[model samples]
Target: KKNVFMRTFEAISRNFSEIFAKLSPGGSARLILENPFSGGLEIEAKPAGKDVKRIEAMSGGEKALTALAFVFAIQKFKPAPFYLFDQIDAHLDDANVKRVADLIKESSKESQFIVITLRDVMMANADKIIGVSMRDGVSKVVSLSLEKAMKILEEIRKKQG
Candidate 1:
């Protein structure tokens, strides 16, 4: 059991550091097992342009990005055919959101992603997009062209102004 634990720990650490570094450029992270025999794992994340000791010390957006990095790392270790994320980037700012989108675009080479996002950055990186709507107690899916989607967004923005 300890042997298995050590092997998994090593793999997770290797994958997490690489993914986290790219997602939050210039950032670094480490996964430390508190005990060798029976230990719990802990994360130490230092985001770009900031110095932090642990994951809990980070801000909301930073934390979200770090979490995503960790998820992507695990995905790398154990790849799958499909991935689904529902507004995972909502807490992130424009720059971080764009970075995440870029990573997703690259990762999609090995897997398919269904990302539910309202951010144009992510949408622009996607190969295909499907919009969802509800009308009269029913849900509908609409295939959207990027131009049409942008125009619809502009119209909505105009109404709110």
Candidate 2:
């Protein structure tokens, strides 16, 4: 049977609101600050459920994580051949970024994952790495096997060390 799936952002926000409403705060979820210039409002899943008094606000990083959660949730309902994540880690911290990487790695077992991220940590968990470099107003692509990518990243770290 063909199942209908919603957009990742929509599914996440809706599920977040629903889950938030059932908690002790009882619909106290608020829309916090967001960058109007960047488009989309900031939403805060404040103090609810087992996380009472714990304000889980979504910044750029949280947004990516939330969106990822939503996508995975949807995938539970409808399977897909592959997933393409574009700079999804752009707004995450070290911990949450690691969570995102873990999720991606886990999901790759079910389907192919093509992730575009600038974070070396995220790339560490990737099966393949396609590097993009821009020069003279043009972009070039360099494909790397997982081992090679790790070596390159190691070299970079050594340089910084």
Candidate 3:
């Protein structure tokens, strides 16, 4: 009983660490099993030489990224078919938002994403774009493929030039 449980804990910790590392290259996550024989997990996320609670000390943008990483870790554990978000990047700055956007794209290879966002950086990473436009007091979704939109963008660029 004890040996099997020990292996299970180690496997989960290793898998979670791998998932976290891939999503946040510079950051590190730990699943601490204080008593190896007794099953329990304590999640600590941050780089070396930083306080374990430093994530709390960080800004909302960084906090958003941290939360996304943990989400990826849990998703890796469960292997979900789809994930949803509603402007989760509202708190993130451009650079951090770009990082989060890229991370989402990487993870999307394993799962579908329905993300409603208002950031160009995040939008730039999407394969399909669903825009909400309001004109003359009416609102509707304007959806298109990124491939289709890029051609028109090129036309506009040429027109400007």
Candidate 4:
């Protein structure tokens, strides 16, 4: 019973593996549903490619990216109307940051994603930028669409010229 399930599940997992690859092109991800000590059913991400190693074998940035990939995968299985990711790129390297940015770009087609990140690479890919500035014990919020912001910058540049 479980063997047939395993056979078919492998096929399904690979199909999703391909899907996730397109999302985070350079890295690889898998949705593992099993348990070791606790015997639980939750998605597990083990990504690797070229300079990359397993998720369990890395830290900082990789930890952030790997967990993000797993949540996206889990969301695919359970479905979500929106996703909120905070400082998701906190520790990933440049390569991993780009990988996650690409994935977020692809996922935005299906629904809304609010990613709060400090990494420039991740922010570069955002359609909208909501900036928070804190000074003198006060926080200010600034919102701008990337296109609008670019146009405004261009106008300023033109005026300067």
Candidate 5:
């Protein structure tokens, strides 16, 4: 009984560490932020290192990436069976949006993800896409398979081109 218990504990601990190692190198402290005003209202994760402090002072786009890093880090702790990211790419630029999409794609290997985004580039990376159309202030869901979404995007691209 004692040997069995030890083996189980070791397996669990190894899994936990594996998750932690997969997290962003800078840690969750990057999620912290200082209040835009009053000089002192701040948010921070523990072990407040220099890098975390620097990230706190970054612009909105940089901060969003920092937060993304933290989110990816925590996935190491308790890997959720599924993740819902609502408008996480709202503040990202074209380059950062692509980077975010890549990160999401990588993370999707561990668990399923549902990302709500308005950016075409971001949606390009999704395996499935669900659109919400607002008509007369009422929202309706429109489901699209990945292929359909890609076709729609291609049409738009052609018009723009």
Candidate 6:
């Protein structure tokens, strides 16, 4: 069991570093297992010019991106049938969102990613966009083309304007 744990830890650490670097340009992530037999895991993150610190010490955007990198790292180590992400990019900037979208698009070929997002970049990379709405306390969902989705959003903006 310890052998397996060590191997998996190494794999996850490498994957996390690679993905984090891509998303944050110069960021790095490391998974530390102090004692393979008894100690729990610890994660360290450093974003670009920042000092290395615990994830909690990072800013909102940095934490979100770090967590995302960790998630993708696990996925790379062992793929699942599908993943559900709820506004994971809510704290990220445009460039980070684009990087996340790019990773999702590439991973989607191997596993399904159900991302709940309002960002145009994420939506643009989706193979199918599903819109959810609520009316009279009942929720409704429908698949939509990007163009049609934009048209509806445009209409809403025009009316508000």
Q: What TM-score do all the candidates reach, one by one? A: 0.92, 0.56, 0.66, 0.63, 0.59, 0.85
Candidate 4 wrong stretches, greater than 4 Å: 1-16, 23-54, 144-161
Is 3 or 4 the stronger prediction by lDDT?
A: 3
**Backbone clash count for every predicted candidate, in the order shown:** 0, 1, 0, 3, 0, 0
Please report, in order, the local distance difference test score of every candidate based on alpha carbons.
Answer: 0.86, 0.61, 0.72, 0.68, 0.63, 0.86
Instruction: Judge candidate 4 at residue 68 and give its lDDT.
Output: 62
Candidate number that wins on TM-score, 2 or 5: 5
Per-residue lDDT tens digits of candidate 2, residues 1-161?
11222244455556556433432133344333344235555555443243322234445554455555545555654578988877877777776677668766876897888888888889878777788889999999988888887787788778563
Better of 1 and 5 by TM-score: 1
Model 3, 45-132: lDDT tens digits are 7754666654566666656766666566656667778988888889878877777788789878878988988776788898789767
Candidate 5 lDDT: 0.63
Ranking by lDDT: 6, 1, 3, 4, 5, 2
Ranking by TM-score: 1, 6, 3, 4, 5, 2
- Minimal lDDT window, size 10, model 2: 1-10
lDDT of 1 by residue, 1-161 (tens): 78787888799889999989998778799887778555577889986677767888888888888888788888888889999999998999888889999889988898999899989888888989898899999999999998888898888778563
Which prediction has the highest lDDT against the true structure?
Answer: 6
For model 1 the local lDDT of residue 158 reads 88
Q: Which lDDT tens digits does candidate 6 get at residues 1-161? A: 77787788888899988988888786677876667567677778987798999888888888888898998898889888999998889999998899999988988898888999988778989999999999999999998998999898788779563
RMSD of each: 1.6, 8.5, 5.3, 6.1, 9.2, 2.2
lDDT agreement of model 3 with the native: 0.72
Q: Report model 6's TM-score to 2 decimal places.
A: 0.85
Model 4 lDDT per residue over 1-54, tens place: 676766655665665676556645565666566642246444444444455455
Instruction: Give the best candidate by TM-score.
Output: 1
